[PDB]
């Protein structure tokens, strides 16, 4: 669930999840994928693509268990789907953290029209 | 879908859908419901409850058609679910507008933890 995601992002990035990635670029958004505007956006594209390859759980409403160990997001799941799902969020939270350096606030609330149709996952 | 919804909110509120309601309170967000922080937030709350009532379509992904006749959102869909959904979105856009007077920007990007568990719809 985006609950975990929100928590992860907040734990990694330390940034307000929605304020910074609730609507960023063409992929860090509620609706759809767009060809990435920058590294931060690519994270969400990858993440959204990560969700796509999922089968067996709802990437939005399926809560999974993970924990903060040695300041590391540790997925506490064996269910292949949740495990992966959790790994999707972790990878995105991390990625997002790793790309704060190039995070551009201009890409916030970036209108979907300025987005090109993203490649296929 | 969020597309129509957004559009409606724009049409009614005149405010940028994502900026003002993509993350406001405990309900105007991608998460679930939480005790509403104010009127605006209560709108979305109602609206999410509204979605729960839907069976036959996905409120998030499923797009639909509605007209904007005489500055009024006219749900054109004939399909029950989509019609219902549209009406749900119409109601929130309307409600949001009606409560624009007490819209408090300090609720934007409100953290979910800091959200009272919402009573079941
Ligand atoms: C999957 C992903 O990266 C993402 C980012 C932001 C929002 Br809002 C939803 C999903
Ligand atoms: C149902 C509703 O009001 C709502 C508001 C904002 C977002 Br993002 C999703 C849903």
Curated annotation (Swiss-Prot), chains A, B:
Keyword tags: Disulfide bond, Myotoxin, Neurotoxin, Secreted, Toxin
Location in the cell: Secreted
InterPro entries for this protein: PLipase_A2 (IPR001211), PLipase_A2_Asp_AS (IPR033112), PLipase_A2_dom (IPR016090), PLipase_A2_dom_sf (IPR036444), PLipase_A2_His_AS (IPR033113)
Distribution of this protein across tissues and organs: Expressed by the venom gland.
Site entry: Important residue of the cationic membrane-docking site (MDoS): 105, 108
DNA repair is among the record's keywords: no
Entries under SUPFAM superfamilies matching the protein: Phospholipase A2, PLA2
A Pfam family reported for this protein in Swiss-Prot or TrEMBL: Phospholip_A2_1
GO molecular function: calcium ion binding; calcium-dependent phospholipase A2 activity; phospholipid binding; toxin activity
Residues at the site labelled Hydrophobic membrane-disruption site (MDiS): 111
S-S bonds: 28-44, 43-95, 50-88, 57-81, 75-86
Activity regulation summary: Rosmarinic acid inhibits the myotoxic activity. Bromophenacyl bromide (BPB) inhibits the myotoxic activity through a covalent binding. Caffeic acid and aristolochic acid, two plant compounds used in folk medicine used to treat envenomation, inhibit the myotoxic activity.
Any one GO BP annotation for this protein: arachidonate secretion
Annotated Gene Ontology cellular component terms: extracellular region
Family: Belongs to the phospholipase A2 family. Group II subfamily. K49 sub-subfamily.
Subunit: Homodimer; non-covalently linked.
Function per UniProt: Snake venom phospholipase A2 (PLA2) homolog that lacks enzymatic activity. Is myotoxic and displays edema-inducing activities. Induces neuromuscular blockage. A model of myotoxic mechanism has been proposed: an apo Lys49-PLA2 is activated by the entrance of a hydrophobic molecule (e.g. fatty acid) at the hydrophobic channel of the protein leading to a reorientation of a monomer.
Official protein name in the record: Basic phospholipase A2 homolog piratoxin-1
Upper classification of the organism: Eukaryota, Metazoa, Chordata, Craniata, Vertebrata
